[PDB]
Design an enzyme around this catalytic site. Structure first.
Site, short mmCIF file in Angstrom:
data_model
loop_
_atom_site.label_atom_id
_atom_site.label_comp_id
_atom_site.label_asym_id
_atom_site.label_seq_id
_atom_site.Cartn_x
_atom_site.Cartn_y
_atom_site.Cartn_z
N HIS A 164 6.28 5.89 9.18
CA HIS A 164 5.36 6.49 8.22
C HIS A 164 4.66 5.42 7.38
O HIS A 164 5.29 4.45 6.96
CB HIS A 164 6.09 7.48 7.31
CG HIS A 164 5.17 8.29 6.44
ND1 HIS A 164 4.12 9.03 6.96
CD2 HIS A 164 5.16 8.51 5.11
CE1 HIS A 164 3.51 9.66 5.97
NE2 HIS A 164 4.12 9.36 4.84
N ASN A 202 2.33 8.66 -1.52
CA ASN A 202 2.45 9.30 -0.22
C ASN A 202 1.19 10.14 -0.04
O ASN A 202 0.44 10.38 -0.99
CB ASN A 202 3.68 10.20 -0.17
CG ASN A 202 4.20 10.40 1.24
OD1 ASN A 202 3.43 10.39 2.20
ND2 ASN A 202 5.51 10.61 1.36
C1 LIG Z 1 3.63 2.34 11.14
C2 LIG Z 1 3.26 3.67 10.51
C3 LIG Z 1 1.77 3.74 10.24
C4 LIG Z 1 3.70 4.80 11.44
C5 LIG Z 1 2.69 5.24 12.49
N1 LIG Z 1 2.67 6.69 12.60
C6 LIG Z 1 1.66 7.37 12.09
O1 LIG Z 1 0.53 6.91 11.98
C7 LIG Z 1 1.99 8.77 11.62
O2 LIG Z 1 2.42 9.76 12.56
C8 LIG Z 1 2.16 8.81 10.11
C9 LIG Z 1 1.98 10.19 9.55
O3 LIG Z 1 2.59 10.50 8.45
O4 LIG Z 1 1.27 11.01 10.13
C10 LIG Z 1 3.05 4.64 13.83
O5 LIG Z 1 3.37 3.46 13.91
N2 LIG Z 1 2.98 5.45 14.88
C11 LIG Z 1 2.82 5.00 16.26
C12 LIG Z 1 1.63 5.66 16.95
C13 LIG Z 1 1.32 4.96 18.27
C14 LIG Z 1 0.00 5.43 18.87
N3 LIG Z 1 0.14 5.80 20.28
C15 LIG Z 1 0.02 4.94 21.29
N4 LIG Z 1 0.97 4.06 21.58
N5 LIG Z 1 -1.09 4.97 22.02
#
Ligand SMILES: CC(C)C[C@H](NC(=O)[C@@H](O)CC(=O)O)C(=O)NCCCCNC(N)=[NH2+]
Length: 208
Positions: free
Chosen positions: A157, A173
């Site tokens: 997150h 947040n």
């Molecule tokens: C490091 C923080 C920003 C977490 C991030 N996840 C998000 O952006 C969310 O789901 C955060 C949220 O609260 O919606 C994350 O790293 N998620 C990974 C997503 C990868 C995208 N998909 C691929 N690999 N194509």
């Protein structure tokens, strides 16, 4: 540096927002630090568009997640970002509309990993983005007080650190005002990679 700082108290932070049911925390946290550095530099407090990023940022994945570096890099490459008003948020991805370049940034820098001193130095300059493990139920149901865990260090997150006090970070947040302390959460400062890994991957935009 100052024992305590709160950019909200300095008019650098816009009202809390709600990313709703869409995995766009990478956008909300990123955009917030942009809105912040812009106010710190120009004296203007302007609410920017997360939706733009969601729609026009191929490198990231709309409601399916994203990363700090690319977001920033986009805003930079694109020559600027539009306001929350002209490109409202929809909590669902869509085709990239054309947008007005209201606010621009020159670059972004990474804060040294798991080094809370460096992070304190950064936050003292301007709000910063950070990645935390927001998967524990205690965190998700956090309502008030100095949160001190439990939570692992699995990064999932993205939030923003808008200030600090001797033993805690003032975190913003993107889940609305009915979560935590009117949208915010005070996370204890424990050194190492920090609570919930908050000190693992910090960043802040730059504007000359
Ligand atoms: C490091 C923080 C920003 C977490 C991030 N996840 C998000 O952006 C969310 O789901 C955060 C949220 O609260 O919606 C994350 O790293 N998620 C990974 C997503 C990868 C995208 N998909 C691929 N690999 N194509």
């Amino acid at each position: 540096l100052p024992e305590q700082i709160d950019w909200r108290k300095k008019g650098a932070v816009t009202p809390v927002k709600n990313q709703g049911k869409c995995g766009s925390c990478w956008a909300f946290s990123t955009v917030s630090t942009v809105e912040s550095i812009n106010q710190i530099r120009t004296g203007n407090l302007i609410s920017l568009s997360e939706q733009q990023l969601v729609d026009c940022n191929k490198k990231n994945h709309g409601c399916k997640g994203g990363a700090f570096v690319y977001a920033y890099q986009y805003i930079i490459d694109n020559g600027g970002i539009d306001t929350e008003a002209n490109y409202p948020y929809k909590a669902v991805q869509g085709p990239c509309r054309a947008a007005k370049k209201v606010v621009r940034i020159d670059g972004y820098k990474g804060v040294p990993h798991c080094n809370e001193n460096a992070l304190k130095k950064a936050v003292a300059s301007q709000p910063s983005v950070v990645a935390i493990d927001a998967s524990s139920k205690q965190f998700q149901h956090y309502k008030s007080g100095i949160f001190s865990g439990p939570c692992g260090t699995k990064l999932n997150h993205g939030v923003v650190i808008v200030g600090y006090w001797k033993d805690y970070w003032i975190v913003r947040n993107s889940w609305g005002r009915y979560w935590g302390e009117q949208g915010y959460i005070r996370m204890k400062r424990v050194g190492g990679c920090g609570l919930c890994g908050i000190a693992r991957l910090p960043y802040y935009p730059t504007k000359a």
